[PDB]
Design a protein around this ligand. Structure first.
Ligand code: NA
Ligand code: NA
Ligand SMILES: [Zn+2]
Ligand SMILES: [Zn+2]
Lengths: 303, 303
């Protein structure tokens, strides 16, 4: 037993410095640059939250697709993935694996990224967002990428982004609504009808689905209602034992993975402590806790 | 024996016919008109869900303020509240009380309605929506109405409405996000700092709050995070025992009230049975179940 934090975030120094050359106004546009452990690898390693934790690292949301053309974005993402792969290789007692960035403005190249994940031990999946370039993840534009991941058995990490079209976006509730929207949009566009074996890991314990499963069941038909159960979820809800229990009740124990949203929310290095405590406070077996902390991650990434 | 369903909906026959003369596009724009237990009283009573249930009745969201001017709206709301009061008086073994409509385009008249609730035994509170006139319920314009209800110890029923400014509104998730936005907007505009004894009952079990309380506690300061616990909630989430448990853990047993959203979602007459079952399946005491089914409502309505 060792704890695998399946959803932690990083900004690798060379990629970050490449993205500053693309737009030097980025430290103004993105407030989370302040967090030292996101930016500074030695800071992260020094103030490491638990010695019994390894992290699965993915890029924080400064994606090249939002700043450059299709070709330059593909080059920047390949470079970022290479750097991410190196970080796991170089620090294998700290990083369990890395989640690759996709150039969603370059569909051909994004498909190549999915294919390259099988060829690299350090790259463990790819990260998708609830919206790419102002379109839903469920948009036909990105469906080939999702189809490729299903075909090759690559697990996808799904992350929220603010929808700028919606007024009153905030850090409290908007991202969770965005996660729920995206799942609904994927489900109703027949994603799991076409690809039942596709694995998506959803940030923040499946967002609004466990609490409002009663609605899903009564609004959607049988096949689509049950398709919401195909998602895997992390535990990144900052504690909350009974909410994590509700998530297990809906998804089953094998779909719930330890995840923290590190280094965010808890300074300096994320919420490893409060989340670990909340999983430990669950009235479930030790086998079940080991699945959450450890086993479910390895089931997810099996190829 | 008696359960009090604190959040059930009704379209009183005379009121609905008055509204049809204002807008003939009403059955077209509002699809839920086909539910015959909502608008036809004898149908509702014939097909009554449970003999040991009394309902607290509020209007479904066809409100004068969205179609008529401030004078006509105030007039129509007064006529609706009178008919609502009449329905309870005339059928006291079915209706435990009624929730009044506010003309939020007529603040003067809205305040008078809050005042009228003390004068009338059949009216037990007033209904507010998450947005009125395309503005937040937290807008300064509506604040004297909330202030009056706090002053007069009138409880308010809060109901979601689609925010038309946001794309991709659906029946699964969008209403729950709007309740959560509303609560945050009220808390952060110092509603419970100015009026800590104000009682607002929130539809759908506090929406996203019990699941994402960890997010609330880590983003907002002490006083505003804890203000979210001042809301009372119903049990209108279509079953889901462990989610109901999550809400009890967050709000405490005194703040969780049986409510169905009747007659919606479950034909012909609402989800009384799946929700009653859900509450009976909770691993709590009979006293606690009694509070939920019955006692919390009567504490809520105490003047
Ligand atoms: Na791999
Ligand atoms: Na009264
Ligand atoms: Zn995150
Ligand atoms: Zn309702």
């Amino acid at each position: 037993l060792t704890k695998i934090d399946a959803y932690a975030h990083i900004l690798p120094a060379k990629y970050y410095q490449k993205m500053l050359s693309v737009e030097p106004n980025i430290p103004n546009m993105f407030p989370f640059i302040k967090i030292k452990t996101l930016m500074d690898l030695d800071e992260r390693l020094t103030k490491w939250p638990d010695q019994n934790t390894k992290q699965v690292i993915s890029l924080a949301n400064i994606s090249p697709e939002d700043f450059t053309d299709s070709k330059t974005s593909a080059e920047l993402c390949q470079s970022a993935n290479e750097e991410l792969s190196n970080l796991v290789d170089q620090h294998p007692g700290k990083f369990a694996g890395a989640v690759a960035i996709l150039p969603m403005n370059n569909i051909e190249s994004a498909c190549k990224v999915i294919s390259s994940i099988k060829d690299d031990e350090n790259l463990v999946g790819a990260q998708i967002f609830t919206r790419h370039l102002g379109k839903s993840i469920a948009d036909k534009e990105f469906r080939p990428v999702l189809a490729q991941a299903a075909k090759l058995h690559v697990p996808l990490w799904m992350h929220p982004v603010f929808d700028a079209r919606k007024p009153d976006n905030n850090l409290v509730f908007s991202w969770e609504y965005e996660l729920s929207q995206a799942m609904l949009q994927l489900v109703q566009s027949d994603l799991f009808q076409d690809y039942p074996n596709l694995k998506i890991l959803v940030h923040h314990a499946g967002a609004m689905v466990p609490f409002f499963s009663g609605r899903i069941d009564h609004i959607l038909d049988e096949k689509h209602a049950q398709d919401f159960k195909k998602f895997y979820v992390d535990t990144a809800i900052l504690g909350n034992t009974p909410a994590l229990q509700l998530a297990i009740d809906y998804y089953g124990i094998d779909h719930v993975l330890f995840g923290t949203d590190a280094p965010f929310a808890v300074m300096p290095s994320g919420a490893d402590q409060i989340i670990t405590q909340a999983i430990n406070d669950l009235t479930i077996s030790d086998k079940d806790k080991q699945k959450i902390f450890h086993d479910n991650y390895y089931s997810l990434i099996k190829e």
